[PDB]
From a paper:
[name] I molecules are expressed on the surface of most nucleated cell types and present peptides (self or foreign antigens) to T cell receptors (TCR) on the surface of CD8+ T cells. Here, we present the X‐ray structure of [name] I from the great reed warbler [name] (Acar3) a long‐distance migratory songbird.
To further clarify the importance of methionine as an N‐terminal anchor, the structure of Acar3 was refolded in the presence of a third peptide KTMMQAHDL and determined by X‐ray crystallography at 2.15 Å resolution. The structure displayed an unambiguous electron density map for the peptide, and when modelling the peptide chain in the electron density map, it became clear that a 9‐mer peptide cannot be accommodated and that the peptide bound in fact is an 8‐mer, lacking a large side chain in the middle. Unlike the structures with YTM and MTM peptides, both having methionine as an N‐terminal anchor, pocket B is now occupied by a threonine (in position 2), while the C‐terminal leucine is in pocket F. The first residue of the peptide, a lysine, is well accommodated in pocket A and the N‐terminal nitrogen forms hydrogen bonds to the sidechains of Tyr9 and Tyr171, while the backbone carbonyl forms an H‐bond to Tyr159. The next residue in the peptide is histidine at P6, which forms a hydrogen bond to the side chain of Arg155 via its side chain nitrogen, and it also forms water mediated interactions to the side chain of Glu113. The final two amino acids in positions 7 and 8 form an extensive interaction network within pocket F. The aspartate at P7 forms a salt bridge to Arg77, as well as a hydrogen bond via its backbone carbonyl to the side chains of Trp146 and Arg145.
Numbering used by the authors:
A (entry chain K): 1 to 8
B (entry chain A): 2 to 275
C (entry chain B): 7 to 104
Write the structure that this text describes.
Amino acid sequence: KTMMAHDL
Amino acid sequence: MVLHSLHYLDVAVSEPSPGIPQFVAMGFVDGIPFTRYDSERGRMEPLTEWIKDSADPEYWDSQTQIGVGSQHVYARSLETLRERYNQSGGLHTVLRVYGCELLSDGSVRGSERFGYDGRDFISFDLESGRFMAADSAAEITRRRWEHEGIVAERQTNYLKHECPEWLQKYVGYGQKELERKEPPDVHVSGKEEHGTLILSCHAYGFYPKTIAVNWMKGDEIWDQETEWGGVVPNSDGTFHTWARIEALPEEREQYRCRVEHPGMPEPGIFAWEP
Amino acid sequence: GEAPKVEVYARSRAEEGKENILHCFITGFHPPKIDVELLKNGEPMPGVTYGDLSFNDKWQFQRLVYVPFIPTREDIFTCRVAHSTMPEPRSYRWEPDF
């Protein structure tokens, strides 16, 4: 399952 | 040693071009693609039959949510990185690879790595448990992520617990395709150019990708003068590779090719038969 | 900018009249925009499919490009690759192992 990326 | 793996590849670009959508996220189990999110379709979709049969509709809808969310995150990230690097407009690319591996010892190794325009940006590892910034621009993100302590918490929790548990679930779903052993079809080709004979040992359509291809001259190993190709993929999910040597034409019959692969009951020996 | 590496290969050992697939595996390049053509005697072959875009540990992209075909003994099969890092396109000939 994917996980969401975090804002940099 | 790695028994199985589950990893994802995220490619996001500032300006889409033919064949390169705004955002694509791809999942791989032991190197085989099995799921895909694409910003043009806006849907998480199966790429194999085993994942389509075993997953419930909630699986595909929750990840469509995660893909839609990541799509907006990368738009902001691309915008943010353009000024931190004092860059002008045009094609810019943010890449992310993350996942886990189940080792033979029972442990799990996991990582999440970001790249920007072909260079490291920021990374996280289960061993170090800390974010590694590649330059001062990435230090801005590292400081913010370390303050809240929450990125490192979510990252450790995904890579060490969620990722391997889904991996074990994926291994059981496609066990028949993941663990199949298809032997290579081997052929030795020969061409004489400019007084030099070039012998090429080709291996067609083998799975999995582990293979040994070696040339022998008499009783001696000839790896010294052997040029190897990569282990490259076919469109059907199998692999291809070759091993090439140069020889005097008059000594063509002293050379033979040995190929070993998990799909062969015995290692096979081959030679050029013009 | 990194120039692409190109390997050309068929799915199976070539046999006359037998359906095959001609692959062009392009690796090691950046930025990801690239123009790939599969030609038979300099003519674009029908049904060229672009594989999916991935990257390696050094953030260099790669892409499989392939087309169904029947290898014939007196024609020239080539993959032609154009990239911003290259001053001119380069052709990579597929050598049939009949």
